[PDB]
Amino acid sequence: MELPIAPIGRIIKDAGAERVSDDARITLAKILEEMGRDIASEAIKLARHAGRKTIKAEDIELAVRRFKK
């Protein structure tokens, strides 16, 4: 399983979206998720660059400023 479209649809709604396809949701879903899988796996080999210290905030924070370009 992966990014539920209901949660997202409320995010996008939170912006001020009104009427959204599930396909709009899922492309965003597959974006933000593959991004999330992106940062995380970054933050993973990050914590793995350590070798051990659990996935952590700065493990994200590094991971994010990492992959992003």
Added chain:
Amino acid sequence: MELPIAPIGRIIKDAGAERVSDDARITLAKILEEMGRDIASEAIKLARHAGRKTIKAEDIELAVRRFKK
């Protein structure tokens, strides 16, 4: 709602996670969700710039790509 850390759990498990820290899960969720709201009002001011109602896999497509990733 702010990207539940369970769902992001199995995402970042897909990454390669084992034992995360709540600082981690939330920070990422704070990242991507900040982005997701971004692509929203983008895809939205997109679908409104059109003069239409329904946001699509396109509307994400232009919103997201318009950003970068």
